[PDB]
Design a protein that fits this description.
It is found in: Cytoplasm. By secondary structure, the chain is of the alpha/beta class. It contains four helices and four strands; from the N terminus they run βαβααββα.
């Protein structure tokens, strides 16, 4: 096996990590077995689904799950997206390369549901940008 594997992790596998897997599937051209997880999973957020549909991507296909050994110890890279109001930062194996791309969870962008939705499209777009640079530039 020489296809890469990559993992995106959050406080819960419902927003940032779900969306990041969505973008990563596009830019990484599936040359990297893309996955996402978190400290918990209860399904993906309806606004995350809308946010990805607003760019012509789907994440409905990748219904959430908690961290699993078959990816945590096997991913060529793991990324934690913790930079939000809870900031739990899911634990990783020390043997594996890690990145930290902290930004606030759009479900926690408190103000009103319209402001939360506006933060879903903002966090989506910023994730997309950094995934582009990760694929294109290696940043």
């Amino acid at each position: 096996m020489e296809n890469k594997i990559i993992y995106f992790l959050c406080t819960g596998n419902s927003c940032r990590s779900q969306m990041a897997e969505g973008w990563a599937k596009q830019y990484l051209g599936d040359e990297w077995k893309v996955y996402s997880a978190g400290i918990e999973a209860h399904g993906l957020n309806p606004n995350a689904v809308k946010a990805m549909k607003e760019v012509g991507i789907d994440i409905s296909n990748q219904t959430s799950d908690i961290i699993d050994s078959d990816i945590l110890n096997n991913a060529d890279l793991v990324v934690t997206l913790c930079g939000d109001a809870a900031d739990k930062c899911p634990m990783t194996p020390p043997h594996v390369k890690r990145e930290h791309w902290g930004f606030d969870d759009p479900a926690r962008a408190q103000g009103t549901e319209e402001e939360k939705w506006a933060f879903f499209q903002r966090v989506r777009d910023e994730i997309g940008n950094r995934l582009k640079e990760f694929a294109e530039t290696g940043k």
